[PDB]
Design a protein around this nucleic acid. Structure first.
Ligand SMILES: [Mn+2]
Ligand SMILES: [Mn+2]
Ligand SMILES: [Zn+2]
Ligand SMILES: [Zn+2]
Lengths: 611, 602
DNA sequence: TTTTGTTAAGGGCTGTATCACTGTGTAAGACAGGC
DNA sequence: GCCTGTCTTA
DNA sequence: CACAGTGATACAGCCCTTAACAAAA
């Protein structure tokens, strides 16, 4: 074979073709034997389907250098959870074996971290924020905010770290600079324009359940994560507000920028308020000022709108002074009781507010009309503690479906048992009704039975097909008509709470939602009297009573869902194991800085480069 | 021509393409690739562009700006990257640099096949007894066909293993480069094939709790290639020997199981097939092709990697609290305490099998105590032949414990107070602790460890403790005792005492006898019929073990961490495959081939 | 006169979209003490 | 016409 | 439960490969 033999030999075996090629080059290509042989070999390589070696030859002939910028190295390190030691091994190995420095060393990545972390860029607030420092070089700060720790004081059992809220807002904005400029471009606006931008910031807070690592005698360790999500940025260009940025995946863990991480129980009110109050204070202060910050060389100004929607009901109730979820006062939007909400199905309005709730706590505290505890509690509608966070409670598209399906399932079981006709039934009769329904759904609808309510059972059960199925088990067909119309009203309502923008996607559904929920409740009250027990769920109450008001308040439902942060805990634990110094004070800030970096849109752009 | 696009260059070169294809098919059988590569390389050399030419030769050899899939495997395995995480890095680097620096996942899998057992062919002459001759066998079920029906004994374990010979093959092929280069380094010929002898340390330990969160225990049966010698004429010249014998890096995993090392039924059931295979290889030659030449290997298996509890379990002996304290000899705790130094290695696997048979058959119709004295502790049938040794650590610890007791008792002067109470001795100990903290900065200890022994066993410490002893005649004795200890220590602590301390190795028996004599004269107070296996072995068996193994220190607590690592991050979360993936991953982690790449910066 | 596109049928690498599979977090109910 | 952790699994 | 996230696996999409016209330049 040619490649077995030596250069003198291969030259011997190829001399004839070499002479022919020199002739071809001089007669057609001006004597470039080098270029002609290169092209011949590249095209031969492409012919044998070996594109890899051909492209590598192309890159080495072009001399185009392969060097990853330290920011890309950081992107990979962060997004694959490599520790410093592991990254260093990979770096030194690739550099030693290819001779080229494809990955950058660790100090370069640290320096690139500095840009993407709070405390790097300068900024100004006009007018300066009330009770907030004007220093711009603040990074990670102790989450206790100088909380007293002497042995005399209350015992401090938690470790927490946080960013300064304005500083974190600056870091997040600078991170999305490229998307802001590209969004202005895509809206036919100018890169250099600086007119006032408005930032709609979604605020969130949740407990992360258990965080313990354990070798049994598991001592639990709970955590609280205080976060914010830039939802949209608009620019005033006229009497018009042009949407230059809108978060594509608003419930993702990718854009949920961690602001404060603490090892404490969300039910531990003393510590919750001690850690969170300084954040709330900076947030308040920013509500009354404009941020000037240099982007692409042009100073810009930003006005903020904080909307605390990332709070599940338990945390809403805790921070807004309300009673625990088992209370008679079931809604965090109005003053209805469970009985009231069960009898009055559709006509309620969003009457609670942070101010009213502050007021009601003061009424509770001072007892100004010298009332008994039952009368006082009635007066203040269950606001028996002082609220300390203004929230905007909502509902997720999931729970609307869930509540409706629970009700329809119970209706199916009772309509199989003809309770419209027989008031009483033993436990055995109802159990056989449910067995009949579950068997028939498994047979005709391929629906597994479930012992516990859940989302996709609801999704698959709330179909007209299932109504035909269950009607195959009902004697009277007037009740067939009733069930078909009830499910028709359900299907006329569902698009409003599921769509991403109901104002645009299903304007007739949104316009007729209130009329349809009225007819829904009227059908339940006339042709379904039996299913009234004075009981109802917050999910059903909110679905029938507050969906149109919540849409008009927020524009949508499905996007302010409670769905994503179930990944957070996992994320947290990972960072604590593989990327954190093993010391209580440092591990927290290492988790914080790694979580910050994991959320930066810059590095995520590098990690989606192929598209 | 170069400023032109693809269709353009294809057209304007179509004529030369037809002529070149004709010449290539007519002269080289249609091998157009070889002809254009050699043409371009020769043209590049012709223009004195040796850099560009050597770089293309390296791209065709895969050494520059393109990582060989084996090097990607080395990096991925050795940094614990999952396939998903590796793929993310691969695709991102490729997309941003345009070049395919890392190789795709399929290429790493194909390179894995080579480094795993079951790839190369080999032969055993004569064929191994009861072992299949198929050579394409890799990971196999560690239960080895153990019955699992509900009627049978309940199987609570999952295990995966290699066939022992197949693993030996893969391990030698891994070190092929080291063997050939060692042959060169001994001024021998690469092509020699005369019988290579491979010494193989065999090892076993349980790995504690493995669970990710009930305890889940694991056993690891593993081996280490310790030395490979070749025969030229009638000298046995060593061609390779491992530099770090006790490293996790060269401890090749053979079988991994989720079972308790004290679960004797399951342990025997799983490990007996590997012992059968090893028994079979003990009388056969391995023919194996390296660098084109068929070579021949014969193996020596030495099960020295067994801590005492596992030794006693697999060799049929009683538990550690027994009166038969030594696994090298028949001494009782009382005997070893009185005699101390004149003992010899007596026990062997065959003697233990026959002592079990004597226990079982009771041929002389003796009572249980007479029978136990007859079989010297072998009440269970052995099933693994071990080479029980000692750890240099335990020699130091046993000696240091004895010296600590002697110090506290010389402070309390126990010879003058035979009826001393518990609290008086406790205050003696407190005195010694306080003064050692004052003079040597030694924090008192609830338990004994190596660092304590290391700092305490000094002559200056003896001076410090003499500062609390009234009689100077006893200063003489304590200082001579410590001097003998310091003479004996190098012998058991070196990695090759026949070069590093030959004077001490020679004088060892004299020194041990003088040490025991001084204990039996001046220090009679600390005789109470009790002694530790570690001290017995240090005073009685160190020279014999050196004669047997040449080294003490040369023959697993990271094992737990490494097993857990691989299970959590690199394995399918399914009982069916987790062990498979863990074993394969550990095996790859131990290959000298990938390790070379990871050390490329040297 | 010099560069590229293009048709049609069809052949390998490569990229990603799943497979199957279990641990695990979260939460939905069940249930029992308030001696 | 109860409240509220603990526990069990889905 | 739902889903995350493992290594293995199946499937689709990739740029071509024969001749010829020919459109842009
Ligand atoms: Mn919560
Ligand atoms: Mn052990
Ligand atoms: Zn309400
Ligand atoms: Zn002995």
């Amino acid at each position: 074979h040619l490649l077995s033999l030596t250069r003198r030999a291969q030259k011997h075996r190829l001399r004839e073709l070499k002479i022919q090629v020199k002739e071809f080059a001089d007669k057609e290509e001006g004597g470039d034997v080098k270029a002609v042989c290169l092209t011949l070999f590249l095209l031969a390589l492409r012919a044998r389907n070996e594109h890899r070696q051909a492209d590598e030859l192309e890159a080495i002939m072009q001399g185009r250098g392969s060097g990853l910028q330290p920011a890309v190295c950081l992107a990979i390190r962060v997004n694959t959870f490599l520790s410093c030691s592991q990254y260093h091994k990979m770096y030194r190995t690739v550099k030693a074996i290819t001779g080229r420095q494809i990955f950058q060393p660790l100090h370069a990545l640290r320096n690139a971290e500095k840009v993407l972390l709070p405390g790097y860029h300068p900024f100004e607030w006009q007018p300066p924020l009330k009770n907030v420092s004007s220093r711009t070089d603040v990074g990670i700060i102790d989450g206790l905010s100088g909380l007293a720790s002497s042995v005399d004081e209350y015992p401090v059992d938690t470790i927490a770290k946080r960013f300064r809220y304005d500083s974190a807002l600056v870091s997040a904005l600078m991170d999305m600079e490229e998307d802001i400029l590209e969004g202005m471009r895509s809206q036919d606006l100018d890169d250099y324009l600086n007119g006032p931008f408005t930032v709609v910031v979604k605020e969130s807070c949740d407990g992360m359940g258990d965080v313990s690592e354990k070798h049994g005698p598991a001592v639990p360790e709970k955590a609280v994560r205080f976060s914010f999500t830039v939802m949209r940025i608009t620019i005033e260009h006229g009497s018009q507000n042009v949407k230059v940025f809108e978060e594509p995946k608003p419930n993702s863990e990718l854009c949920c920028k961690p602001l404060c991480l603490m090892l404490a129980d969300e039910s531990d009110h003393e510590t919750l308020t001690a850690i969170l109050s300084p954040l709330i204070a900076e947030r308040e202060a920013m509500k009354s000022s404009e941020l000037t910050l240099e982007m692409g060389g042009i100073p810009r100004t930003f006005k903020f709108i904080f909307r605390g929607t990332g709070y599940d009901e338990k945390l809403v109730r805790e921070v807004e002074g309300l009673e625990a979820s088992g209370s008679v006062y079931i809604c965090t939007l109005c003053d209805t009781t469970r009985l009231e909400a069960s009898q009055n199905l559709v006509f309620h309005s969003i009457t609670r507010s942070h101010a009213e709730n502050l007021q009601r706590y003061e009424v509770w505290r001072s007892n100004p009309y010298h009332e008994s505890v039952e009368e006082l509690r009635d007066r203040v509608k269950g606001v028996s503690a002082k609220p300390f966070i203004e929230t905007v409670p909502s509902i997720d598209a999931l729970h609307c479906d869930i509540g409706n399906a629970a009700e329809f399932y119970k209706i199916f079981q009772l309509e199989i048992g003809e309770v419209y006709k027989h008031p009483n039934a033993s436990k055995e009769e109802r159990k056989r009704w449910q067995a009949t329904l579950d068997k028939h759904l498994r047979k005709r609808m391929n629906l597994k039975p479930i012992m516990r309510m859940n989302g996709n059972f609801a999704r698959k059960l709330m179909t007209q097909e299932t109504v035909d199925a269950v009607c195959e088990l009902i004697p009277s067909e007037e009740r067939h008509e009733a069930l078909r119309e009830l499910m028709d009203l359900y299907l006329k309502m569902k698009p409003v709470w599921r769509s991403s923008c109901p104002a645009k996607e299903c304007p007739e559904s949104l316009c007729q939602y209130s009329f349809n929920s009225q007819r829904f409740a009227e059908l339940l009250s006339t042709k379904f009297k039996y299913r009234y027990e004075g009981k109802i769920t917050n999910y059903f109450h909110k679905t029938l009573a507050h969906v149109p008001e919540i849409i008009e308040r927020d524009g949508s439902i499905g996007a302010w869902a409670s769905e994503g942060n179930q990944s957070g805990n996992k994320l947290f634990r990972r960072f604590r194991k593989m990327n954190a110094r093993q010391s209580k004070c440092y591990e927290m800030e290492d988790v914080l800085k790694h979580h910050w970096l994991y959320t930066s849109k810059y590095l995520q752009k590098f990690m989606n480069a192929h598209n």
